[PDB]
């Protein structure tokens, strides 16, 4: 589901920056190591030259030229690794900007993601409320009210239906009552 | 405003509902009494 995928992408970015941080460690490891190499190399060059310089005056001259050839060969190795160092340096700062660029991407993606979810979730909640408030076209609570109101109207009808019979015998009987009723009215005329 | 509108709907629905039930229940009770009083057409106590 998109909710799950979306936060998963956030989680992925957290792994990514961690991977890039060690990758930084790997490149920097070679900067350190290649400093170490040049530092050694420059010593080695001097050292055997020093042996050779005494060897000029002392015993075998010829042997000193061998030591110098070894020295010089190694000097070439150092210069070759100086070439490699240049590649390291340039690549390193390229990687530094690439991390910063990714960090910007992540930062924006995360903030956008958060407000995207929030404003969407808020909107749907509002819509659910307006629907349930409104009942546009039809609203079931009124239909339930109506059902029991139909029963009221039925009972109302039925109640006056008992009245509909209740009247129609009585007129015979009532006439006898009214004769008696007139008598007490005649007693009032007597008292007057 | 939508809450206030609903609150009005609820308030009226409830008061209407209450008096609807009461007046209906009162009416049926009256009708039951008038029937049992009257025996219009026939009345079993007179038959006994």
Author numbering:
A (entry chain D): 24 to 215
B (entry chain D): 120 to 167
Q: What did the paper state?
A:
A prominent member of the PspA family is the vesicle-inducing protein in plastids 1 (Vipp1), also known as IM30 (inner membrane-associated protein of 30 kDa). Vesicle-inducing protein in plastids 1 (Vipp1) is critical for thylakoid membrane biogenesis and maintenance. Vipp1 appears to have two functions: in membrane maintenance (that is, during heat or light stress) and in thylakoid membrane (TM) biogenesis and/or remodeling. Vipp1 binds to negatively charged membranes and membrane binding depends on stored curvature elastic stress.
By analyzing ten additional unique structures of N-terminally truncated Vipp1 in the presence of lipids, we show that helix α0 is a major determinant for the types of polymeric assemblies that are formed by Vipp1 and that helix α0 serves as a membrane anchor for Vipp1. To obtain more insights into its function, we analyzed the interaction of a truncated Vipp1 lacking α0 (Vipp1 (α1–α6)) with membranes using cryo-EM. We found that, in the absence of α0, Vipp1 forms PspA-like rods that are not capable of membrane tubulation and apparently do not interact with membranes. Thus, α0 is critical for membrane interaction and tubulation of Vipp1 and in controlling the polymer architecture of Vipp1. Membrane tubulation of Vipp1 is largely mediated by α0, as truncated Vipp1 (α1–α6) assembled into helical tubes that did not internalize any lipid membrane in the lumen. Although it has been reported that truncated versions of Vipp1 lacking α0 are still capable of membrane binding, our micrographs and cryo-EM maps show that Vipp1 (α1–α6) does not engulf membranes in the rod lumen and does not assemble on membranes, while it may still be capable of binding lipids in other conditions. Moreover, the truncation of helix α0 also affects the assembly state of Vipp1. Additionally, the monomer orientation and rod symmetry differ from the rods observed upon incubation of the full-length protein with membranes while the Vipp1 (α1–α6) rods adopt a SynPspA rod-like symmetry and orientation and cover a large range of diameters. In the PspA-like Vipp1 (α1–α6) rods, however, a register shift and a larger distance to the next layer of monomers would make it impossible for α0 to reach α1 + α4 of the monomer in the adjacent layer. Thus, the presence and absence of α0 coordinates different assembly states of Vipp1 and interactions of helix α0 stabilize particular polymeric Vipp1 structures.
